[PDB]
Design a protein around this ligand. Structure first.
Ligand SMILES: O=C(N[C@H]1c2cccc(O)c2C[C@H]1C(=O)O)c1cnc(NC2CCOCC2)cn1
Length: 167
């Protein structure tokens, strides 16, 4: 049993809710919150910009030190950093950004990072300003992630579409 509330069980292991991942993180304090990161960990907009703003920029400060030491992530890759006031840990995962011309096949590799964590709160990868098909991202999630994932979907109209089209 866990404290995630009002989630629609889609499969054995995938759950979804129309909710703000920030409030959801602030309420649940999950072991892992996933960030929709880029390779430079520059949290400018979307989930990344929103989570960073909620951490009073501490996420960005930590991320800049990470990049200075380790260099950029790979598209499809991830790193584990602090969850600050939102979670124990933040799993920064880089899905492909269609608005940068990145290969959508890398979306499966991105979701594979979730399998290293037993339970996660996460956004649907490569949705919103990343420009990939969200019905597609949800399908890849369901077909790739085997651990227990709670997807918080910010946009209500996206959520309603994701529910009504899920096979
Ligand atoms: O851009 C946001 N989400 C979309 C996005 C963007 C980029 C990559 C992605 O994978 C996704 C998933 C998609 C969604 O979930 O709809 C977002 C923005 N802000 C939020 N929280 C604020 C907290 C303070 O008050 C205002 C709201 C919560 N989500």
């Amino acid at each position: 049993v866990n404290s995630f509330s009002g989630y629609l069980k889609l499969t054995d292991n995938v759950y979804i809710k129309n909710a703000d991942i920030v409030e959801e993180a602030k309420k649940v304090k999950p072991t892992v919150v996933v960030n929709a990161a880029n390779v430079y960990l520059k949290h400018g907009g979307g989930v990344a910009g929103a989570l960073n703003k909620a951490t009073n920029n501490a996420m960005q400060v930590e991320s800049d030190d990470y990049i200075a030491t380790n260099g950029p992530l790979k598209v499809g890759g991830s790193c584990v950093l602090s969850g600050h006031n939102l979670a124990k840990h933040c799993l920064h995962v880089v899905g492909p950004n269609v608005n940068k011309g990145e290969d959508i096949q890398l979306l499966k590799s991105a979701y594979e990072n979730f399998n290293q964590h037993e339970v996660l709160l996460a956004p649907l990868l490569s949705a919103g300003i990343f420009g990939a098909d969200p019905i597609h991202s949800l399908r890849v999630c369901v077909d790739t992630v085997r651990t227990n994932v709670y997807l918080a979907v910010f946009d209500k109209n996206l959520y309603d579409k994701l529910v009504s089209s899920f096979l």
